[PDB]
């Protein structure tokens, strides 16, 4: 079955199963279980610990520019529980290693065609 942009966004960024990173090993486990170390060690990736509905709602909040210059990005009005994952020095494809950083920040996502479906995670602030 084809992986839609919606499904891909959920695979790469949604973890409503936990309220926050459980430990420092969180990223290593999640990056692997979500297939983010298969085609390479995805350098950076953020997981959101909120309901899909609250993240989806961001598409109708504060409109802002995306890091790439596109105009379909949106920043959340309130802060959200998120976990930042970044490849560390001891990492080396195919043996990927990550640093886990838990936090409560505002998220910014890109909504397809400026619609209401989040398809990319731009950043957290």
Question: Which one, 32 or 62, has the nearer CB to Cs ion?
Answer: 62
- Among 120, 121, 122, 124, the active-site one is 120
Which residues are annotated binding-site positions for substrate? Answer: 8, 11, 42-46, 67, 86
Separation between Cα atoms, residue 111 and residue 26, nearest integer Å: 27
Nearest C-alpha neighbor of 105 from the set 85, 74, 76: 76
Site string for Cs ion, 47-86 (x = CB under 5 A): ------------x---------------------------
120 in catalytic set: yes
Residue 7: count of CB within 10 angstroms of its CB: 11
106 in catalytic set: no
Question: Which one, 30 or 59, has the nearer CB to Cs ion?
Answer: 59
Q: How far apart are the first and last CA of the chain?
A: 35
- Among 9, 12, 13, 121, the active-site one is 13
Question: Which one, 26 or 74, has the nearer CB to Cs ion?
Answer: 74
The CA angle 22-91-105, to the nearest 5 degrees, is 40
Separation between Cα atoms, residue 42 and residue 22, nearest integer Å: 21
Instruction: State the catalytic residues.
Output: 13, 120
Binding site residues, Cs ion, CB under 5 A: 59
């Amino acid at each position: 079955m084809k992986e839609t942009a919606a499904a891909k966004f959920e695979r790469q960024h949604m973890d409503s199963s936990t309220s926050a990173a459980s430990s420092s090993n969180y990223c290593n486990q999640m990056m692997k279980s979500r297939n983010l170390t298969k085609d390479r060690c995805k350098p950076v990736n953020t997981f959101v610990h909120e309901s899909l509905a609250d993240v989806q709602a961001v598409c109708s909040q504060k409109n802002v520019a995306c890091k790439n210059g596109q105009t379909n990005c949106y920043q959340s009005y309130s802060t959200m529980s998120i976990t930042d994952c970044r490849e560390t020095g001891s990492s080396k494809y195919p043996n990927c290693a990550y640093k886990t950083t838990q936090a409560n920040k505002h998220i910014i996502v890109a909504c397809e065609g400026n619609g209401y479906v989040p398809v990319h995670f731009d950043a957290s602030v």
